[PDB]
Design a protein around this ligand. Structure first.
Ligand SMILES: *[C@@H]1O[C@H](CO)[C@@H](O)[C@H](O)[C@H]1NC(C)=O
Ligand SMILES: CN(C)C(=N)NCCC[C@H](N)C(=O)O
Length: 246
């Protein structure tokens, strides 16, 4: 399990939480010095629990699939909540079993569905540590529209930050003031699966991508990633989705 407390939080404590989250995801192999997430895990060991506390000390526990860093659901007091998708229903067999009641959210966890339910794309949703405090507070008592937006914040400030150093740093900049995600942030989120695949395929293609990945850099400019000597690979990406899950 990993924990994060918004009360007294600063860029340093958030970084320690993201480090903890990365370290809780198992791997047997690194590919170009980046941990390779496992193809599969059986039973309850497939799920990591994150304990998040809002500024007031109230808490949710979030269940994360350790093979892909996908949030499956969360526990708020005695009620569990899960995404409307097969992987999450499976997860509900193993975590939060002692909840008095289980609600299936009226959407899956994919970004496009969540944005529809929330009423806005995440280009327009401010993120940061104050937004995460708000998200935790929202998820404490059920409200499916509010929850969709809260979940978009939660996913980007936990899972996406775990995957990319740049995104972690973006959230650190927003420790005390929310701001919509940078164009590079959205680009990286969208490209994780693509990048994970091309990095694994580069193991037998001399570090060369079979298919180049187009990204936006720290300044809105549309660039092509063609090999493992790229910044994105050497410095930024921190976890690889196993190609067996792509
Ligand atoms: C590989 O990527 C580097 C760094 O982005 C770039 O400068 C170079 O042009 C690329 N080289 C090849 C052979 O793809
Ligand atoms: C990290 N996440 C949540 C995202 N970037 N989107 C990936 C797909 C979501 C998945 N269905 C889920 O269960 O979370």
């Amino acid at each position: 399990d990993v924990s994060f407390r918004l009360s007294g939080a600063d860029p340093s404590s958030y970084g320690m939480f993201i480090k903890d989250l990365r370290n809780a995801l198992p791997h047997t192999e690194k590919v170009y010095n980046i941990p390779l997430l496992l193809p599969s895990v059986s039973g309850a060991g497939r799920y990591l629990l994150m304990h998040l506390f809002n500024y007031d000390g109230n808490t949710i526990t979030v269940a994360v699939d350790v093979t892909n860093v996908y949030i499956m659901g969360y526990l708020a007091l005695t009620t569990s909540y899960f995404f409307n998708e097969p992987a999450a229903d499976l997860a509900s067999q193993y975590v939060f079993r002692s909840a008095r009641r289980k609600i299936t959210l009226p959407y899956s966890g994919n970004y496009e569905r969540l944005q529809i339910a929330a009423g806005k794309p995440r280009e327009k949703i401010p993120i940061g540590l104050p937004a995460l405090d708000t998200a935790i507070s929202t998820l404490l008592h059920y409200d499916s529209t509010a929850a969709a937006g809260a979940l978009l914040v939660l996913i980007q400030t936990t899972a996406e930050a775990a995957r990319f150093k740049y995104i972690e740093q973006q959230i650190q900049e927003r420790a005390y003031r929310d701001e919509v995600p940078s164009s590079a942030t959205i680009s990286l989120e969208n490209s994780w699966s693509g990048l994970s695949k091309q990095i694994q395929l580069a193991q037998g293609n001399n570090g060369v991508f079979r298919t180049p990945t187009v990204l936006v850099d720290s300044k809105g400019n549309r660039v092509q990633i063609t090999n493992v000597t790229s910044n994105v690979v050497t410095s930024n990406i921190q976890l690889l989705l196993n190609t067996k899950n792509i």
